[PDB]
Amino acid sequence: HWTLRDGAALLLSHIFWTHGDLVSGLYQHILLSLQKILADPVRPLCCHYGAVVGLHALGWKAVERVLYPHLSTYWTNLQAVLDDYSVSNAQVKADGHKVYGAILVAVERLLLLFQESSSGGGAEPSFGSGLP
Amino acid sequence: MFLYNLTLQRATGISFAIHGNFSGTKQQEIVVSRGKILELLRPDPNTGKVHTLLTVEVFGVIRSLMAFRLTGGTKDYIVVGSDSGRIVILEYQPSKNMFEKIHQETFGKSGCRRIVPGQFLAVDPKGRAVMISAIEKQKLVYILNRDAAARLTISSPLEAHKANTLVYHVVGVDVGFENPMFACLEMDYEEADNDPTGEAAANTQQTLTFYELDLGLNHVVRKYSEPLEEHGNFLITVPGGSDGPSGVLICSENYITYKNFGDQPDIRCPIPRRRNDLDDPERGMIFVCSATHKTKSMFFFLAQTEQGDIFKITLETDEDMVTEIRLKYFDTVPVAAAMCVLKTGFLFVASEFGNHYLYQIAHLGDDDEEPEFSSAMPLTFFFQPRPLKNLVLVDELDSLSPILFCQIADLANEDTPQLYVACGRGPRSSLRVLRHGLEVSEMAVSELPGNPNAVWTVRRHIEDEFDAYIIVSFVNATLVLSIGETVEEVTDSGFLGTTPTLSCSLLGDDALVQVYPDGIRHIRADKRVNEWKTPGKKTIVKCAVNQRQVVIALTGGELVYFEMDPSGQLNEYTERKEMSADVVCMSLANVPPGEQRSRFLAVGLVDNTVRIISLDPSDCLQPLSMQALPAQPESLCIVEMFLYLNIGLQNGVLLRTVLDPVTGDLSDTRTGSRPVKLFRVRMQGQEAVLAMSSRSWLSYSYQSRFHLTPLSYETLEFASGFASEQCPEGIVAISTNTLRILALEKLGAVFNQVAFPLQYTPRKFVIHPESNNLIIIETDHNAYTEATKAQRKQQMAEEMVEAAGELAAEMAAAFLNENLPESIFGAPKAGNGQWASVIRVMNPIQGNTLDLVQLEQNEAAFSVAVCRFSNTGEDWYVLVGVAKDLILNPRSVAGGFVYTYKLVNNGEKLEFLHKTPVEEVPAAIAPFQGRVLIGVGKLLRVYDLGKKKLLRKCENKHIANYISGIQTIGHRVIVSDVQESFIWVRYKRNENQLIIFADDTYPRWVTTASLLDYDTVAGADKFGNICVVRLPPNTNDSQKAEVIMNYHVGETVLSLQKTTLIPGGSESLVYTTLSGGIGILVPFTSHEDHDFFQHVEMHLRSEHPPLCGRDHLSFRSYYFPVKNVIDGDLCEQFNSMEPNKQKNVSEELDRTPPEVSKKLEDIRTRYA
Amino acid sequence: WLVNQHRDSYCSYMGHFDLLNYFAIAENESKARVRFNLMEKMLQP
């Protein structure tokens, strides 16, 4: 049932780039609601995974400044995977998008630079080996 | 929309091999290491055959494998180095036939990261400390100690980290009686990052750092720091102390150096060169492996170079130092990764690309004709090639070469689909054909007039190993025969076989029993006629032979039992049981030599209600129970591995039942609409069954498990065993109006193959639809051709003539007369821009070639396709791409050409027609709608047949990457990008323009693509990521493609294809891998089918951890998460669990363990 | 960044056995020469 968010995310990006800059006074409120639902540990993993591409794959101007300062919103579930618990949804599936999060950034630079690469090296080393 | 992972073939490539004693016996065995599969095998000096002991998948990438020994112990331990952040210790139990985990110590992160050890692993040969370290910044020391209970204990690793340091190789150096001593090559790169000019890159030498450990003060300190001159690769473990000096042999580039701590000067010894070598002198020659042989008399080592030359290092040691190093030419073997020398004169060479062989040492090579080479002689030596002369072919295995392309289709007149594998390496390549069944071998073919229907095999004695009488029966006649290696008609048998004999068994020690419906005549060895007449005119329908009992069945449902009296006569029971049906089958198991006799008896009836008949006199001729039957049976038998009940019917079914008076399990499999006859056969000592259908079916037992492997043969009606001097283990199978003898040498479980010699590694091949032919293109890196080698030899011959040595140069004739084979002695070809392009058409039915068309040396073929044009009629065209000026390290190309062939006589003769230039080497050609499309690099164009040049109709430039694959269909064109996942392009007919409307968000290194239907497009990956992309129905025929299933196999998959495997089932995604395994994907039908296996996957992750300590979910979801795919590899290990744990799992699922295993085998039963 | 990403890519080639197997196929070399070349390229990526 994960096609529901994929269609919503595709439409979310569609309205972001089509005409969302004419009289859009909510253009900042849509961004504001993103960290209100994501940057809080009281929410479950289902909605936490629902905002993994709603911020990164929307540009790079006001995106990198958000992803960097957070430490207690991504490292918590990374080391909470070897627990032998009930059914999960994003304990290993959310790691796919964070690897993808270092793809577009590297492509833009090929055409925080050293610190970002060093920080990503301690999280996933296969990202720089599968695609450069 | 759901998939199930199932594999049939496994990785047969050896990456790491060790030698030692792990089973506790006195016979040596080898433990091989695959990429992620642990296989155990042992040799056999008696028969020279090697059989697999146990194959368990560890679900983890193994990076190293080695062993050690304890002081005063008797059993070795297994240490496995993987990509995880933990080390494991294994102890195989021969009785349990399983690997038991001893310790599990997690120290750091897992995966293929920078700070993960596992690649390099070394131990003190005395058995006190072991070293594991990563490439950089990490060095760990584990201390092994045991208590008074003879139990091995492991302590915490020691912190010996050193940042900004590069580790080349770690080896365990044995130095007399002292602390475990370690030598390694270290490198510093601090100056390289601080010198942008480039001066720090030059003249950068490495050191040989020696580490000393203290067991009392618990510290690690660097003792020696000795810089080197040239770069090193690995060290040879040379034992010291009593036997040999305590030193190490460092292999270098074109040189070898011995270095020992103290007052030992360095020894320099150059490596010789083969006479008048055609290779580039600027190229080097290095070593790939080093074997250690521990012999009480003398010690010597073996090495291997790139050219397959074996040099033995013999040391004339002093009291403490060494004198010199000696070298000699001994043997010639193909290119191998690592070899292990075994005791009692055995040498196993484990190849890295090709088949695995097993050589036997026959001669030590003492005082040969070729002089040895040492270091004391000054000055650039040379050696002459020599044949093997020492090793012979003993054993061979069905090792699968890495596969670059595969294709499954129907090319023979039979309905069984054949599998074609294009693999190999250069001259050792072979386009082998895979067949599902066993290897059918014939020894003698004879013709017998009449209609043979039964052949018997009676031995002289029960415990003998040779036969005494063979009888062949007919519908009306019978002839007697005997075996004397001059088999003809025998006369003094004394059988009087005028009447059709139903059966010829062995009742007495050397007596035979013949069955005829006019009376039973016992044929004794002594001149005694024990003829029993049949009361009345009634006849007999079947028989039941036994070692100590005689059972018959008269017409109308009448049963008479005979008992074998030890005095010499026979008795008859005083009661006949009445039955309501007609006897259709009869069977009885053999009397156990240890026990008294058998009790369970099964009688087939038309009423389809089989009843168990007791054999004891207390309850003789009495009903016991009843069991329902589907239809009228045809044959029945009782197999003992533990007895089992087997039921055969008149149609293509095979029913199996456990030994139980009450009805139990009911397992069936398709066997045909033919009467199935089940016989008694012997293989591997245990009993087995042999059913008959349109194809012969065999079901034997292996590792306490019953399989179902059919036989590649036509319809048969009768079969029996065979045992003589020529073939101790054979099977006799009579055919239509002829006599044939079969044998079973190779086990041949699945995927038998036949080899065919080739010249270069084929890339792709296309099946000719009409004349059933193939088109094969060949290209290899640094390859030559016949013309280039011929002119090089002539130029080389002229140069030596020009040299005019002291005219006195008579070796010109000998150089051109004696030529060495390329497949076994290697290929002496060098250069940078040297290639080959061989186009060959081979008939799959035969093994010979049809035409050989060669091309220029600087030309290579990467793609081939068959196209049609509307201007011509039913003519078939062949187009082969040409590569020009390929440069590896920098990106600099020059272009290519496309060759058009007439294809004279539908794939029997090729001729040159014309040429056309292109700006880039083509990669994939796919015609559609009567025209041809060739992807020229980043530019996508549509071509058409012209007079001199291909007419251009459209041009595309939106593709900013290299096109690696083009798949076309009647509506759209699917483009497989090397960087992007998929590009969907539609080409119009009236507009004539390539339109790009959709793409994919996920970047993938797509190697190949396949089409399942109109909407689904599959794709592979360089690492083994298989995904299927579904496009929404609303597409502009803004369109970012979604993904419904993503799964990582863990091994490189280079081909995807979906077809029907066996007639009578559904299709499945059959894909092979680069390791050499074949995996299938089983689709699901109902919701509960996926739910039950989902619960099994959830339960087995916690109830059965992997052997090497690797997390199951993240290992499969390494690159991409696993979606809509259920792993069946973990479910296959359900039979390798303790019964108490299995009982708990079954009760958790509210089922029984027999039923759980039935569904596990049912998945393979349906689609395989 | 260039140094960090290069050192995280070339060093991961040896961990995978099939990636090493693929490297030994594209070139007429053995697994020994392949692992030496990647190890000698660490001096200046």
Swiss-Prot record, chain A:
Coiled coil: none annotated. It is found in: Nucleus. Residues 115-132 are annotated as: Disordered. Belongs to the TAF6 family. Functions as a component of the PCAF complex. The PCAF complex is capable of efficiently acetylating histones in a nucleosomal context. The PCAF complex could be considered as the human version of the yeast SAGA complex. With TAF5L, acts as an epigenetic regulator essential for somatic reprogramming. Regulates target genes through H3K9ac deposition and MYC recruitment which trigger MYC regulatory network to orchestrate gene expression programs to control embryonic stem cell state. Functions with MYC to activate target gene expression through RNA polymerase II pause release. The PCAF complex is composed of a number of TBP-associated factors (TAFS), such as TAF5, TAF5L, TAF6, TAF6L, TAF9, TAF10 and TAF12, PCAF, and also PCAF-associated factors (PAFs), such as TADA2L/ADA2, TADA3L/ADA3 and SPT3. Component of the STAGA transcription coactivator-HAT complex, at least composed of SUPT3H, GCN5L2, TAF5L, TAF6L, SUPT7L, TADA3L, TAD1L, TAF10, TAF12, TRRAP and TAF9. This is TAF6-like RNA polymerase II p300/CBP-associated factor-associated factor 65 kDa subunit 6L.
UniProtKB/Swiss-Prot annotation, chain B:
One of its GO terms (cellular component) is nucleolus. It comes from the Eukaryota. The keyword Disulfide bond does not apply. Residues 1052-1075 are annotated as: Interaction with SF3B5. Gene3D superfamilies: 1.10.150.910, YVTN repeat-like/Quinoprotein amine dehydrogenase (2.130.10.10). Residues 193-231, 763-781 are annotated as: Interaction with SF3B1 and SF3B5. Pfam families: Beta-prop_RSE1_1st, Beta-prop_RSE1_2nd, CPSF_A. The record marks N961, K1123 as: Interaction with SF3B1. GO terms for molecular function: protein-containing complex binding; U2 snRNA binding. Residues 105-119, 145-168 are annotated as: Interaction with PHF5A, SF3B1 and SF3B5. The record marks G284, E306, E352, R425, N889 as: Interaction with SF3B5. InterPro entries: Beta-prop_RSE1/DDB1/CPSF1_1st (IPR018846), Cleavage/polyA-sp_fac_asu_C (IPR004871), RSE1/DDB1/CFT1/CPSF1 (IPR050358), WD40/YVTN_repeat-like_dom_sf (IPR015943), WD40_repeat_dom_sf (IPR036322). The modification Phosphothreonine is found at T1152. The keyword 4Fe-4S does not apply. Residues 1001-1022 are annotated as: Interaction with SF3B1. It is found in: Nucleus. GO terms for biological process: mRNA splicing, via spliceosome; negative regulation of protein catabolic process; positive regulation of DNA-templated transcription; regulation of DNA repair; regulation of RNA splicing; RNA splicing; RNA splicing, via transesterification reactions; U2-type prespliceosome assembly. Keywords: mRNA processing, mRNA splicing, Nucleus, Phosphoprotein, Spliceosome. The modification Phosphoserine is found at S156. Belongs to the RSE1 family. The core of the protein consists of three beta-propeller domains. Component of the 17S U2 SnRNP complex, a ribonucleoprotein complex that contains small nuclear RNA (snRNA) U2 and a number of specific proteins. Part of the SF3B subcomplex of the 17S U2 SnRNP complex. SF3B associates with the splicing subcomplex SF3A and a 12S RNA unit to form the U2 small nuclear ribonucleoproteins complex (U2 snRNP). Within the SF3B subcomplex, interacts directly with SF3B1 (via HEAT domain), SF3B5 and PHF5A. Identified in the spliceosome A complex; remains associated with the spliceosome throughout the splicing process. Component of the spliceosome B complex. This is Splicing factor 3B subunit 3.
From Swiss-Prot, chain C:
Its main location: nucleus. Coiled coil: none annotated. Residues 1-45 are annotated as: Interaction with SF3B1 and SF3B3. Signal peptide: none annotated. Component of the 17S U2 SnRNP complex, a ribonucleoprotein complex that contains small nuclear RNA (snRNA) U2 and a number of specific proteins. Part of the SF3B subcomplex of the 17S U2 SnRNP complex. SF3B associates with the splicing subcomplex SF3A and a 12S RNA unit to form the U2 small nuclear ribonucleoproteins complex (U2 snRNP). Within the SF3B subcomplex, interacts directly with SF3B1 (via HEAT domain) and SF3B3. Component of the minor spliceosome, which splices U12-type introns. Belongs to the SF3B5 family. Component of the 17S U2 SnRNP complex of the spliceosome, a large ribonucleoprotein complex that removes introns from transcribed pre-mRNAs. The 17S U2 SnRNP complex (1) directly participates in early spliceosome assembly and (2) mediates recognition of the intron branch site during pre-mRNA splicing by promoting the selection of the pre-mRNA branch-site adenosine, the nucleophile for the first step of splicing. This is Splicing factor 3B subunit 5. It comes from Homo sapiens (Human). The chain holds residues 31 to 75 of 86 of the full protein.
